[PDB]
Amino acid sequence: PVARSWVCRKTYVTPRRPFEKSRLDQELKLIGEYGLRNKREVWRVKFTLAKIRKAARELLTLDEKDPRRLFEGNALLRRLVRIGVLDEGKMKLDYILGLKIEDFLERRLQTQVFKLGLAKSIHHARVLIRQRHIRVRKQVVNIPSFIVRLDSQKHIDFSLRSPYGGGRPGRVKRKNAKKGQGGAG
Amino acid sequence: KEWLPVTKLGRLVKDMKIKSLEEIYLFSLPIKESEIIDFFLGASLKDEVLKIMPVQKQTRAGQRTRFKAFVAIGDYNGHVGLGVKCSKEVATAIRGAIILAKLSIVPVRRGYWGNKIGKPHTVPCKVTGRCGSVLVRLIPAPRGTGIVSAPVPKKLLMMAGIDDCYTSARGCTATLGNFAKATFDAISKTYSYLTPDLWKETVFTKSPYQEFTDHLVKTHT
Amino acid sequence: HGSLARVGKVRGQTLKVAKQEKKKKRTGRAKRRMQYNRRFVNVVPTFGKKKGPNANS
Amino acid sequence: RELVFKEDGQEYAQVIKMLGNGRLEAMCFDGVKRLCHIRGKLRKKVWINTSDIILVGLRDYQDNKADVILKYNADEARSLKAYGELPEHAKINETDTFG
Amino acid sequence: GKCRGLRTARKLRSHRRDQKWHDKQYKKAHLGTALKANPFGGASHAKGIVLEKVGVEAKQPNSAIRKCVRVQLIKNGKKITAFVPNDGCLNFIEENDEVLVAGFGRKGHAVGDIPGVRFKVVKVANVSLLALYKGKKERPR
RNA sequence: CUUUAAAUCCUUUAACGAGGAUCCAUUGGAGGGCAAGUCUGGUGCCAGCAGCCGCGGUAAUUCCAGCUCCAAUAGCGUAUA
């Protein structure tokens, strides 16, 4: 007997229809619009929203004025407000079922960098996230699938060790400066 | 390219003295002129083919093939229709099918799943349509679920305006005409089901014919 | 002829031509970007039935 | 039509008796009883009668089963008998179609 | 159901067991005959030795010959008939050369126009047939 | 430098390290099911393809090769319970 974890689970689900036009076009449109890598990421976001919707339907099945329904409904509502895809005016459990997948794709770090104004295009935003140039509250992020919170949207900025945000110049700039000093002396 | 009506309903809609198709559906008046609904429902009434199938008649010399065309009509916020036409060519068949489907359009109401919040989105009860051996059953669904079905009742429920369904079928579903007609019958049977939200006695509103007897005599013989 | 049922006859007698030297194809994220580009945002509102990408009639 | 001969993979055989099931048997002129099979285009386009001349396809993985290629009527038979392609123990016996 | 009594579970259970035995798939999967007469014996792949190469004919509506081999097994030694899939791969198979046979597609059933063959070969001489087709690997010498 | 019994791995970090950024992304398909050529050359019920319907008869939308493309993507195909 060894002391390991042995706990893991899938985060994406394969749809039953492999080849039909409309859902393929809709997923391909979402991949092109938000600049994602492959269909597994949008399937992962759909899987997470499906699990959230299943939990919301399970809470809405149980009758009013119960302790566990109110407790889990307020917990899930507070988490879904604090992740940034809900509003405090819409503070009800029956509005969870009306959410769409684009709302979950809005709070991704790549599109948040693209919409804040730190990159030209959304693909430029993704190759900025993968490049380690920015930070979220004095700590850099490399992963484009970094979901942000409502209080964490304002604090995103360039990292210290980056030529875009002020710091040491990169390899190609130093190589060109060395070439210029070699050609000059 | 003008419209010359043959029934008094066509003229009475033509002179803008019938406001909507709702009282035609209320008084259960038959529709025989296809340009009335084109006068009422305009740019939002879209159509597409479902299946074109050939049938054969055996004669002395060779085989004669006539093409049968199916089509669905209906706007995304209510009414929906269906029509079947067969002809020797494809263009005549699709034009006759489009005309006959536009002529025969049913209304549908929408209900709620548990909580009556916002606009209605689903079928208010369990309805069943049957023709041949084809069975189809419609269940009310929670909001944001989406239509889960075969592709052809998915298309028909998109033209019906309902976006939340749970379906269950039985029989030979490969016959597209009977499956489409059974789903159309299941959609059209949603009014012959007395829920307790309309148990009050209705007030009998005024019939169009007797109200515009004077205009009918003034216009036509 | 030789004989009727010879193994590897057509592929043995098939003319042997090689590949054409070309650049590499874009793989990964930009393949999906170009696919979305060509499929959605470089279209014109035509009429009739749509044409397949391999139509070379 | 044209007088084609045997090549590397073909020999000659003499059909003896009639059998069904799309198969029939013959003695090749090497002296081996072979069981040939009618191959596609000689089934009902052309018929085969008793004791005729048949080009035979061979096998590179066994020697128990043969094939069929063509057929010769009377003048092709005496033409290939003129050069000599069979042992003299076998007899053509003036095979043709009866009048 | 027909028996709708409040204290009836046994008749439902025994009738369901009997009508489950009156089936084909449940009869096949739960008897020793369908696995005892199975050449693979509940195995997906198997090795064997080729002895003869026999070309079997096609069915009625199409006309061809089909290249096949006669394979004896190692674990139980019975004689089966395999089928080399691709075009011109019989030249790689010599007398007494070990192969790797597998299933043919329809779970112990004849597939297509080949009569009486339920197996096909995957690898020969401990190398895949696909690599011999594509010119990737060479047979050992 | 850190880690560790000593390492190694990860991270921190010097000096190096990419224009066709040759530091070169494969696997199964293109008749219907089922997304995607009646393109070109060769064989001619032969070779073979095909889970099913079926495709090949000297003009193959299905075979053998090239180009184009479609599906998933460091993954894809086959056989079995």
Swiss-Prot record, chain A:
Residue numbers carrying Phosphoserine: S152, S162
What cellular component GO annotations does this protein have?
A: cytosolic ribosome; cytosolic small ribosomal subunit; nucleolus
Q: Which subcellular locations apply to this protein?
A: Cytoplasm; Nucleus, Nucleolus
Identify the keywords attached in UniProt to this record, alphabetized.
Answer: Acetylation, Cytoplasm, Isopeptide bond, Nucleus, Phosphoprotein, Ribonucleoprotein, Ribosomal protein, RNA-binding, rRNA-binding, Ubl conjugation
**SUPFAM superfamilies xref list:** Alpha-L RNA-binding motif
Q: Name one GO biological process term.
A: translation
Known InterPro entries for this protein? Ribosomal_uS4 (IPR022801), Ribosomal_uS4_CS (IPR018079), Ribosomal_uS4_euk/arc (IPR005710), Ribosomal_uS4_N (IPR001912), S4_RNA-bd (IPR002942), S4_RNA-bd_sf (IPR036986)
S4 RNA-binding domain span: 107-181
* Cross-link Glycyl lysine isopeptide (Lys-Gly) (interchain with G-Cter in SUMO2) per UniProt, renumbered positions: K92, K138
A Pfam family cross-referenced in the UniProt record is Ribosomal_S4
Assembly information from the UniProt record: Component of the small ribosomal subunit. Identified in a IGF2BP1-dependent mRNP granule complex containing untranslated mRNAs. Part of the small subunit (SSU) processome, composed of more than 70 proteins and the RNA chaperone small nucleolar RNA (snoRNA) U3.
Q: What is this protein called?
A: Small ribosomal subunit protein uS4
Q: Which organism is it from?
A: Oryctolagus cuniculus (Rabbit)
Curated annotation (Swiss-Prot), chain C:
Location comes to: Cytoplasm; Nucleus
**Residues bearing PTM N6-succinyllysine:** K49
Please, which domain of life does this record's source organism belong to? Eukaryota
> Oligomeric state and partners?
Component of the 40S subunit of the ribosome.
Please explain the role this protein plays, according to its UniProt record.
Component of the 40S subunit of the ribosome. Contributes to the assembly and function of 40S ribosomal subunits.
Q: What is this protein called?
A: Small ribosomal subunit protein eS30
Organism name? Oryctolagus cuniculus (Rabbit)
Region of the whole protein represented: 77 to 133 of 133
Curated annotation (Swiss-Prot), chain D:
Major localization class = cytoplasm
Any keyword tRNA-binding? Answer: yes
Q: Where in the cell is it found?
A: Cytoplasm
GO molecular function annotation: RNA binding; translation factor activity, RNA binding; translation initiation factor activity; tRNA binding
Q: Which UniProt keywords apply?
A: Cytoplasm, Host-virus interaction, Initiation factor, Protein biosynthesis, RNA-binding, tRNA-binding
Domain S1-like, first and last residues per copy? 1-73
Listed under GO biological process in this entry are: ribosome assembly; translational initiation
User: What do the Gene Ontology cellular component annotations say?
Assistant: cytoplasm; cytosol; eukaryotic 43S preinitiation complex; eukaryotic 48S preinitiation complex; multi-eIF complex; synapse
Q: Which domain of life is it from?
A: Eukaryota
| Function according to Swiss-Prot or TrEMBL | Component of the 43S pre-initiation complex (43S PIC), which binds to the mRNA cap-proximal region, scans mRNA 5'-untranslated region, and locates the initiation codon. This protein enhances formation of the cap-proximal complex. Together with EIF1, facilitates scanning, start codon recognition, promotion of the assembly of 48S complex at the initiation codon (43S PIC becomes 48S PIC after the start codon is reached), and dissociation of aberrant complexes.
In the record, the note on similarity to other proteins reads: Belongs to the eIF-1A family.
Q: What is this protein called?
A: Eukaryotic translation initiation factor 1A, X-chromosomal
- Residues of the whole record sequence present: 24 to 122 of 144
Swiss-Prot record, chain E:
User: Which PROSITE patterns does the record associate with it?
Assistant: RIBOSOMAL_S12 (PS00055)
Q: Where is this region: Disordered?
A: 1-25
Q: Does the keyword Ubl conjugation apply?
A: yes
Residues that bear N6-succinyllysine: K53
The PTM entry states: Hydroxylation at Pro-61 affects translation termination efficiency.
**One of the record's GO molecular function terms:** structural constituent of ribosome
Biological processes, Gene Ontology terms: translation
Q: Which residues carry this modification: N6-acetyllysine?
A: K134
Identify the keywords attached in UniProt to this record, alphabetized.
Answer: Acetylation, Cytoplasm, Endoplasmic reticulum, Hydroxylation, Isopeptide bond, Nucleus, Ribonucleoprotein, Ribosomal protein, Ubl conjugation
Q: Where is the composition biased (Basic residues)?
A: 1-19
Q: Name one Pfam family in it.
A: Ribosom_S12_S23
Give the UniProt entry's GO cellular component terms. Answer: cytosolic ribosome; nucleolus; rough endoplasmic reticulum; small ribosomal subunit
Localisation: Cytoplasm, Cytosol; Cytoplasm; Rough endoplasmic reticulum; Nucleus, Nucleolus
Cross-link Glycyl lysine isopeptide (Lys-Gly) (interchain with G-Cter in SUMO2): residue positions:
K36
Q: Per its UniProt record, what InterPro entries does this chain match?
A: NA-bd_OB-fold, Ribosomal_uS12, Ribosomal_uS12_euk/arc
Residues that the record marks as modified (3-hydroxyproline) are P61
Give a short account of what the protein does: Component of the ribosome, a large ribonucleoprotein complex responsible for the synthesis of proteins in the cell. The small ribosomal subunit (SSU) binds messenger RNAs (mRNAs) and translates the encoded message by selecting cognate aminoacyl-transfer RNA (tRNA) molecules. The large subunit (LSU) contains the ribosomal catalytic site termed the peptidyl transferase center (PTC), which catalyzes the formation of peptide bonds, thereby polymerizing the amino acids delivered by tRNAs into a polypeptide chain.
Listed under subunit, the entry gives: Component of the 40S small ribosomal subunit. Part of the small subunit (SSU) processome, composed of more than 70 proteins and the RNA chaperone small nucleolar RNA (snoRNA) U3.
NCBIfam families (UniProt xref): PRK04211.1, uS12_E_A
Report which gene this protein is encoded by: RPS23
